[PDB]
Structure formats: C-alpha cells, structure tokens
Paper text:
The yjdF motif RNA is a riboswitch found primarily in Firmicutes, located typically in the 5’UTR of the orphan YjdF protein gene. This binding promiscuity makes the yjdF riboswitch stand out among riboswitches, as most typically recognize their ligands with high selectivity.
The crystals diffracted to 2.77 Å and 3.05 Å resolution for chelerythrine and proflavine, respectively. Both crystals belonged to the P1 space group and contained two complexes per asymmetric unit. Our structures show that both the chelerythrine- and proflavine-bound yjdF riboswitch adopt the same global architecture (RMSD 1.528 Å). In agreement with the low selectivity of the binding site, we observed a difference in the orientation of chelerythrine across two complexes in the asymmetric unit, with a flip along its longer axis (while planar orientation of the ligand is well-defined, flipped orientations within the plane are possible). In addition, in one copy the positive charge on the nitrogen of the endocyclic quaternary amine facilitates cation-π interaction with the pyrimidine ring of A56. Notably, the ether oxygens of chelerythrine, which tend to be weak H-bond acceptors, do not appear to be utilized for recognition by the ligand binding site and no localized water molecules were observed mediating interactions with the ligand. The most proximal pair involves C99 and U116, which reside within the P4 helical stack directing their WCF faces towards one another, possibly forming a single hydrogen bond (H-bond, 3.9 Å).
Numbering used by the authors:
A (entry chain H): 4 to 228
B (entry chain L): 1 to 215
The structure:
RNA sequence: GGACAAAGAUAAAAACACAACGUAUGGCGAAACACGUCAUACAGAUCCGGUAGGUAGUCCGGACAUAAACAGCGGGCGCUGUUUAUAAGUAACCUUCCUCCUUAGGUCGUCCAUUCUUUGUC
C-alpha cells in the first residue's frame, strides 16, 4: 500500500541542472522525514539529503551542499531534489526513502522507491560497432572452444545481446558494460561451444541498442586457415 | 566531524545453513541509532533492523542485531538461498547520515580453475582504426584472479579494462573479460600478445597467446 | 515604704507584597531540528558591618557568587580586567523638620522596649 515512485531522471550535460520527483502513495509526506540516497553504478549507498516533518528543515551531505536543494510539496504529496552544477561523479541511481514512524521503526528507512537513473556525461547517442571474437583456429579437436561478439563505442546504456535469435542461451556470459575513457560504453558477450560444431553450426549474435535505433546481427565464424 | 561507519568484511562466502555475522564500527557514538538493510541486485534496499536490535515488521526471525559500544553486528542464524545479497549499515544519530561500504554475502563453492581464451583483434575493427584483444577467464571460483598483459614479453599497465559477471545460478562460478585497447599502428608494431593469468586453482600461471596476423 | 542614678540578668521586636514571561533537561504529539503540550529544575530571601537603645530576606555599605555587555592579551575557543544586574518596593500610604528641584527634593517617625537582681545617694 505504501509506495514511493521517483521520476525525472535522465541524461544531463556536466554543469547542467536536473529536478527529481518522489511521488508518494499510501501515506502523507507531511508526517514523515523524506530522504534521498544515491548509488553510483557498482558502488555502495550514499546518503544525499533529508527533509524533516512540520518544520521543513533540510539537511544535506558535503558532496551536495550548495548545488542540491530538497523541497516538499504537500498538496501534490511529492518531494523534490533540484540538482545544479552537476558533474560526472554525480552519475547514480537516486532512491527516495521514507523514514519510519519513531514508535514503529525508530529512524530506519522503511519504504524505498525503485530508483531513477541520472547520467552526467557529454557523450552523444551512438550505436555500437559489433565485431566477431572468432573462435581460435588452434581450438582442441574434441575440446571446448570459445567465440564471442564485442559491442563497442555505444552511448548510452543499455544494449541487449542474444545468440542465434535466443535459441542459444546456455554457456553464454554477457559481461557488464565498462565505461571507457572515451565516455562510450563497451561490453563483450561470449559463449563456449563444442569444437566439433564450429564448421557445422553457425553462430550469430543479435545486438540491440534502442537509444540509437540500432539492430545488428553479426555472424561469428572461424577465419581462414 | 562526520561520523564514519566501517563495515567488515567487504565480501563474505558462506553456505546455506551457515551462521553469518557482519560488523560496523562507528568513529564516534551513534547511540543505538543504527539500521541494517538488504539489497539484491537491481533492486532497492529493504529495511532489516532498526535501532540496532529491533527486527523490522515482516523480516524473518533468523536476523538479529546486537550493539557492543560503538560496534554493531548483524547476524543471520542460518543462511537460506534467498539471503545472498549485499548488506548495508546506516547511522542516523547525527546528520549528515553515513552508510557502511557494504558487505556482499555469496555462495561458497569448490575451487574451479579458469579456462582462458585469447581473441585477436577482428579485421573489421582494424579497418575502423582501433585494435582490442580480449582475454576470457571462464567458469572459475573464487572471484579473486589476476590478469596480466604481455606484448613481446613487455608488461602493459593502464591500457586494460576488466569486467566480471555475477555468480552463476547453476555453476556458482564467475567469469571475467579483459580487453586491451591499442591503436592499429601500435598493434602493427608488435608481434606477440599474451594473456597471463594467475588463480588459486591454477598450480602455475597459465599463459594463452597468439602471434599477430597468423591463422 | 518612696525618689533620682549607675551596673547586671532576662524578654521583645516593622506595614503590603514577594513575579517563570523565559531557559535547561526529559516524555509525548504521525515529531532527530523547529513548533505545541506536559513533567522537573532554575528568579542573591549568601556573608559581614551599619541604620546612634534594640529588632532586617527586602533599608544603607562592602565582600563573595551568578549572568550579560564591553576592552585587552594568547594560540569559534581559552584567559584577564572593567562595567551593569541580581526583582517590583523601604516604591505607595500615614507622618516630623528643612530647602524656592516647593505641581518637588531631602529628612524625623511607623515594630519592641518585659520581668527581676545588686550598688551609690537622699
Ligand atoms: C538597629 O537595627 C535596626 C535599625 C533600623 C531598622 C531595623 C529594622 N527595620 C525593619 C527597619 C525599617 C523597616 C521598615 C521601614 C523603615 C525601617 C527603618 C529602620 C529599620 O519602612 C518599611 O519598613 C533594625 O533592626 C535590625
Ligand atoms: K606503454
Ligand atoms: Mg533593592
Ligand atoms: Os567531519
Ligand atoms: Os609497444
């Protein structure tokens, strides 16, 4: 019944502003403290801001002091986080959390939102290039071989990778994307197959990057000699 | 001065039915204003314990919290498969609120040696003007492993990016990809490229290499 | 028997009123701060002298203590010094004397002084 839904995230350029919303349901925000906590990709939780009930008192963390403002609009039952002068280190999923009732939950945060992603980067939308990680010609005659696709130089996340239009799903590892110094993302998807099958069976990886409207099907095959 | 919460261990390996303990140490007094949360991948944290001893409504009774001075512990009496996640501690005694760096509780498994493969740059990529050589370490446990790049037996530093998969649902294993990015010209000026791997299950450091422009 | 006088013992003794607005801690209010409310504590009734015979929590003077403001020194904080405050009120009322602050200012007064003992001289 109690729910918090964040919204307003997206991609913003460094030094630009964004305004996040936290719409509440099943409770009135005026009777609770509201918190914003962020999580950078691959990192832990970081408390960002809090607003107290019946006074409006705002408390912020050093990383955001002067550049972030937490506000509440009781008539729309929504909390807000205004971000100015944003920089790359601010890229994260932002949760809003309700602080619990003191009699029932102490000061723990008893309800959270799903989060909303904020990406601070000067990169422009770009479709990936997809290259064949061909199977080793020196592969064992009766041993396992490995083949793959490299999805490279795409912004922003995500991409989806299937193999043989999803028929081949066993033994496939799609790796997490890593942001490279270019500001563009890169990942690789690999599958291990029996080496007896390399000439008989055709392997295709299907890469989709919806943000750029990019669908590519790349066939990976052993190279000459 | 802001309060620091130091959580140990950063990563823990255990099995179903294990008794698990995670600790948090505060730089100052935080009284009992400490809470513990569980976060599973891709999901929001869920409150487990508040006021550092109290079980939050609906959380299973196999979770408990204890306070000794400025040290707080979260204990799971018997692990269950749904209990493998990252756990966080938070102080709310004084603003600004601080959270622990986190502790990930992962399934413990038999030591498995990595299978290492090397993929030379594709010809399409060389037509694009860049070269990437990918080392794959497949289906190994534990996650700790070292990957080193040798170009003509010359160790490369600052040109390699690694990516690791989460633990597999069936193998309870990890996989790692290492990509080495060189210019097409720099790639064209050397002949031998090797991926040297060290792992606990490897009795010697395995090296898988290829020679440029060769079958 | 009485009178005057000194020296003792003993007793007595001042009207009216005397203020938590506020602060601190804690509990509670849908409540980390703010706010509302409740509980508890906090307002120099300290010490010494004097007020002309005596009687002072409140008069007069000094000391100490506590609080605030300000000045200075040292490396928001600490120390030092000075000033002020510590109820309203010895205001108001009654009341004597004095002074052209006279539609005022100061000043005498407002309470108690009981009972008994010794000695000196008529
Ligand atoms: C020698 O001892 C003395 C001397 C003078 C006094 C005194 C006591 N009181 C109460 C008063 C007094 C009381 C008052 C007043 C005036 C007053 C004037 C003088 C005294 O007007 C208001 O009430 C006292 O006893 C210790
Ligand atoms: K170099
Ligand atoms: Mg006085
Ligand atoms: Os600090
Ligand atoms: Os070189």
């Amino acid at each position: 019944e109690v729910q918090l839904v964040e919204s307003g995230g997206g991609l913003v350029q460094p030094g630009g502003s964004l305004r996040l919303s936290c719409a509440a349901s099943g409770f009135y925000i005026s009777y609770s403290s509201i918190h914003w906590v962020r999580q950078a990709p691959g990192k832990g939780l970081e408390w960002v801001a809090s607003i107290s009930p019946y006074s409006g008192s705002t408390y912020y963390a050093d990383s955001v002091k002067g550049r972030f403002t937490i506000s509440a609009d009781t008539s729309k039952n929504t909390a807000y986080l205004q971000m100015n002068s944003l920089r790359a280190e601010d890229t994260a999923v932002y949760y809003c959390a309700r602080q619990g009732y003191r009699r029932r939950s102490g000061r723990g945060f008893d309800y959270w939102g799903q989060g909303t992603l904020v990406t601070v980067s000067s990169a422009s939308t770009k479709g990936p290039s997809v290259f064949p990680l061909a199977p080793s010609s020196k592969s064992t005659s009766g041993g396992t071989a490995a083949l793959g696709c490299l999805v490279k130089d795409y912004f922003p996340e995500p991409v989806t990778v299937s193999w043989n239009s999803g028929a081949l799903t066993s033994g496939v590892h799609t790796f997490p994307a890593v942001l490279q110094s270019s500001g563009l993302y890169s990942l690789s998807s690999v599958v291990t197959v029996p080496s007896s099958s390399l000439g008989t069976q055709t392997y295709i990886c299907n890469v989709n990057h919806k943000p750029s409207n990019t669908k590519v099907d790349k066939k990976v095959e052993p190279k000459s000699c | 001065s802001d309060i620091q919460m130091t959580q140990s261990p950063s990563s823990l390996s255990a099995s179903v039915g294990d008794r698990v303990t995670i600790t948090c140490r505060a730089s100052q007094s935080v009284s009992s204003a400490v809470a513990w949360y569980q976060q599973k991948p891709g999901k929001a944290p869920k409150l487990l314990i508040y006021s550092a001893s109290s079980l939050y409504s609906g959380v299973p009774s196999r979770f408990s919290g204890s306070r000794s001075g400025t040290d707080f512990t979260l204990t799971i009496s018997s692990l269950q498969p749904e209990d493998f996640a990252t756990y966080y501690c938070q102080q709310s005694y004084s603003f600004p609120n601080t959270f622990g760096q986190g502790t990930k509780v992962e399934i413990k498994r038999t030591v498995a040696a990595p299978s290492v493969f090397i993929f030379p740059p594709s010809d399409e990529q060389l037509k694009s003007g860049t070269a990437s050589v990918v080392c794959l370490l497949n289906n190994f446990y534990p996650r700790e492993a070292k990957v080193q790049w040798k170009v003509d037996n010359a160790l490369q530093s600052g040109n390699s990016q690694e990516s690791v998969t989460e633990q597999d649902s069936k193998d309870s294993t990890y996989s790692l990809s290492s990509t080495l990015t060189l210019s097409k010209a720099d790639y064209e000026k050397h002949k031998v490229y090797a991926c040297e791997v060290t792992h606990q299950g490897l009795s010697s450091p395995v090296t898988k290499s290829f020679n440029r422009g060769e079958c």
